Amino acid sequence: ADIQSFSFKNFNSSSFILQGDATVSSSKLRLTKVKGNGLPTLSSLGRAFYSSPIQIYDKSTGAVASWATSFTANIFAPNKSSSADGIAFALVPVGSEPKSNSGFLGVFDSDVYDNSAQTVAVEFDTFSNTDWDPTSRHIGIDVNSIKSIRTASWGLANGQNAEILITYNAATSLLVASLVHPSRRTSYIVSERVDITNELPEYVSIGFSATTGLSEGYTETHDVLSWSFASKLPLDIASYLVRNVL
Amino acid sequence: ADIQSFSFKNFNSSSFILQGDATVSSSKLRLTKVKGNGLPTLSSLGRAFYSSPIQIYDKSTGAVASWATSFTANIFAPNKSSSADGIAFALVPVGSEPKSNSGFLGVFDSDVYDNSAQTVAVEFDTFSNTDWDPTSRHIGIDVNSIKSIRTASWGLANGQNAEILITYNAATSLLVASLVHPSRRTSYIVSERVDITNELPEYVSIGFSATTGLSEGYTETHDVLSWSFASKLPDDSEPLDIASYLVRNVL
Ligand SMILES: *[C@@H]1O[C@H](CO)[C@@H](O[C@@H]2O[C@H](CO)[C@@H](O)[C@H](O)[C@H]2NC(C)=O)[C@H](O[C@@H]2O[C@@H](C)[C@@H](O)[C@@H](O)[C@@H]2O)[C@H]1NC(C)=O
Ligand SMILES: [Ca+2]
Numbered sequence A: 001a002d003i004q005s006f007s008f009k010n011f012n013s014s015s016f017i018l019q020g021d022a023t024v025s026s027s028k029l030r031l032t033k034v035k036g037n038g039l040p041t042l043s044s045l046g047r048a049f050y051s052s053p054i055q056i057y058d059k060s061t062g063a064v065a066s067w068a069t070s071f072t073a074n075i076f077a078p079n080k081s082s083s084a085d086g087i088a089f090a091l092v093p094v095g096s097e098p099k100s101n102s103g104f105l106g107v108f109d110s111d112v113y114d115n116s117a118q119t120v121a122v123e124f125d126t127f128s129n130t131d132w133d134p135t136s137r138h139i140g141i142d143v144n145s146i147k148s149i150r151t152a153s154w155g156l157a158n159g160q161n162a163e164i165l166i167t168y169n170a171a172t173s174l175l176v177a178s179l180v181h182p183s184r185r186t187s188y189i190v191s192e193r194v195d196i197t198n199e200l201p202e203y204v205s206i207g208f209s210a211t212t213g214l215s216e217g218y219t220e221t222h223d224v225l226s227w228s229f230a231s232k233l234p235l236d237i238a239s240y241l242v243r244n245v246l
Numbered sequence B: 001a002d003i004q005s006f007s008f009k010n011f012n013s014s015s016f017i018l019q020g021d022a023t024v025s026s027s028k029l030r031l032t033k034v035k036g037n038g039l040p041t042l043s044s045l046g047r048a049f050y051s052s053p054i055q056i057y058d059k060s061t062g063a064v065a066s067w068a069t070s071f072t073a074n075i076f077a078p079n080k081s082s083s084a085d086g087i088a089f090a091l092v093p094v095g096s097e098p099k100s101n102s103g104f105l106g107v108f109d110s111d112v113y114d115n116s117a118q119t120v121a122v123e124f125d126t127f128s129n130t131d132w133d134p135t136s137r138h139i140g141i142d143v144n145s146i147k148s149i150r151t152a153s154w155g156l157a158n159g160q161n162a163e164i165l166i167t168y169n170a171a172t173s174l175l176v177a178s179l180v181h182p183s184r185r186t187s188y189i190v191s192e193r194v195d196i197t198n199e200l201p202e203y204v205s206i207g208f209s210a211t212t213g214l215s216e217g218y219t220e221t222h223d224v225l226s227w228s229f230a231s232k233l234p235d236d237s238e239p240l241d242i243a244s245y246l247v248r249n250v251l
């Protein structure tokens, strides 16, 4: 079993591929732009990936990796009811370039399943796009489309840290994502099956993508404060969290 | 604190950078070239590095990382008394290109301290260069020069696995390297402090470098069968739990 893991208590490391408006400052990863006064911008799109590709599975041995990632994000919308568009943790093709903005979170182009996109993402959607989204803000699992194959309601604690945990169990093909707002004591979780070897390439770049609205006040910040990741290609979370995120 | 680790029970992944004659076959890392019949070549030079850079220290916070690496190597010299030149575990500048061959193991150019080399290595020297080496085969700690700052005698169990453990304790600035030949039940060790922040860049590539002789039958194989590495970089200016490490990763 090949194992690998990284843990960043803070950023500002040559370990990231920054695209769009993504930037590092105050040792935190700011995916979308924030003006001098500290307020969010419109039409922003930023992505950040770990500089080295991760092998998700091995075509020749049929082996499929199990992995887990955790990060703390902070989303602040000056006008809560105007929050848009969200942040997503994504697994994309290695040289991948940004996709459509706003509602597509920079990782997808349509709400129609397109295997050629070779992209899977867990989204934290703050703006309800009526053509495809649920009524409220939500956590969703996106498989080669912006229309989640499964979602769960999420109560956004504006400007409050969100502690996220995403795991993939190759044995059950189950992808689980949970979000906790320690300040409001709330927690959410979503789980669905994903046939990984069929939706993604053998090697992918893991990272984040975020965007803001295009109309006057539909914007918010999208900051990541810490990030851990562990992969095992042929996972004991109990020791993972302790020796990596806690 | 930032942490990084990996463990390879066999090679195959494209998480390795190969230079010179370095190659992967039979799921093992072969640093120096071998002929169809399985015999070593002359004037061979091969290097292999983890594709991702490791941060050894943080200039702005004064923090210095503690790390450990373990790997199993197998060195086979058709003619034992003709064994040359050796294999080295090295920390080099990220885009680093191979250096001098043969006695310099592909990581150094002279036996004169040159800080600009920005390279540290732990060598497993099978051939004695009278110009700077000790009389017998040895393990040595090289700091920006091929002339080790400290060495220890090593009894080469030809063609037998060598289990190596190298650790760096930022608290004591001590670098320790040990080698064990389980089949012959022998073991060796060396230690010396190294002011890491002064000999290397903030980010380095870790890996292996090996070479063979230029003269006659002075050659041998340089194969790596497995490799683990773990690093821990604090938030401010503490050793590492080698036990937990060694269990869930090597033993
Ligand atoms: C947060 O965003 C809301 C939706 O954009 C704002 O309400 C909207 O304000 C517009 C002027 O900026 C106005 O044309 C819309 O009719 C109105 N829409 C709704 C559904 O209320 C809201 O702005 C404040 O409240 C409105 C009603 C006006 O009084 C504005 O002058 C105010 O800025 C925003 N809320 C806050 C607390 O800023
Ligand atoms: Ca949306």
Ligand SMILES: [Ca+2]
Pocket: B085, B103, B125, B126, B127, B128, B129, B133
């Ligand atoms: Ca020598």
Ligand SMILES: [Mn+2]
Pocket: A123, A125, A133, A134, A138, A140, A146, A148
């Ligand atoms: Mn959605």
Ligand SMILES: [Mn+2]
Pocket: B123, B125, B132, B133, B134, B138, B140, B146, B148
């Ligand atoms: Mn020597």
